[PDB]
């Protein structure tokens, strides 16, 4: 009822699972070489070749 | 398929797979994919 | 027009531009774009030209 981190083994599997889903969304904002990281903007200004 | 026509020399760059321009947007349009070989020569003193 | 070492530079702002009347009025030797398609300039909307 008082001491926190009494369940520190169960908090790690929540923190590990959330840090992985967090990094998955944040990789949608990288360019990886292209001119834009957003797929609608290279379809709004370029030819299909 | 052998397609034959006449143009000038300034528009001879317009015949290549996948680009725009005057001939390519309104006349002879080549699809991206490959065709084959493109062969050209001059007709300054042959037909003009 | 200016000289090549002393090239004139001006700024375009707050207008409804039409690039189709520059494209189809064929009087130009080289007309090439970079990162933009020449036909989609009718739709694009910029900060400054």
UniProtKB/Swiss-Prot annotation, chain B:
Binds to host ACE2. RBD also interacts with the N-linked glycan on 'Asn-90' of ACE2. Cleavage of S generates a polybasic C-terminal sequence on S1 that binds to host Neuropilin-1 (NRP1) and Neuropilin-2 (NRP2) receptors. Interacts with host integrin alpha-5/beta-1 (ITGA5:ITGB1) and with ACE2 in complex with integrin alpha-5/beta-1 (ITGA5:ITGB1). May interact via cytoplasmic c-terminus with M protein. May interact (via N-terminus) with host bilirubin and biliverdin, thereby preventing antibody binding to the SARS-CoV-2 spike NTD via an allosteric mechanism. The chain holds residues 396 to 443 of 1273 of the full protein. This is Spike protein S1. It comes from Severe acute respiratory syndrome coronavirus 2 (2019-nCoV). Attaches the virion to the cell membrane by interacting with host receptor, initiating the infection. The major receptor is host ACE2. When S2/S2' has been cleaved, binding to the receptor triggers direct fusion at the cell membrane. When S2/S2' has not been cleaved, binding to the receptor results in internalization of the virus by endocytosis using host TFRC and GRM2 and leading to fusion of the virion membrane with the host endosomal membrane. Alternatively, may use NRP1/NRP2 and integrin as entry receptors. The gene is S. Residues 8-10 are annotated as: Integrin-binding motif.
């Amino acid at each position: 009822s008082s001491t926190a981190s009494a369940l520190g083994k169960l908090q790690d599997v929540v923190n590990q699972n959330a840090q992985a889903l967090n990094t998955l969304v944040k990789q949608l904002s990288s360019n990886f070489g292209a001119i834009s990281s957003v797929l609608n903007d290279i379809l709004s200004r370029l030819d299909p070749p | 398929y052998a397609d034959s026509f006449v143009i000038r020399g300034d528009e001879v760059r317009q015949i290549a797979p996948g680009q725009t321009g005057k001939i390519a947007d309104y006349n002879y349009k080549l699809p991206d994919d490959f065709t084959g070989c493109v062969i050209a020569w001059n007709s300054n003193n042959l037909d003009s | 027009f200016a000289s090549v070492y002393a090239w004139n530079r001006k700024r375009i702002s707050n207008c409804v531009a039409d690039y189709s009347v520059l494209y189809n009025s064929a009087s130009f030797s080289t007309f090439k774009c970079y990162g933009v398609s020449p036909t989609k300039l009718n739709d694009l909307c910029f900060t400054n030209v």
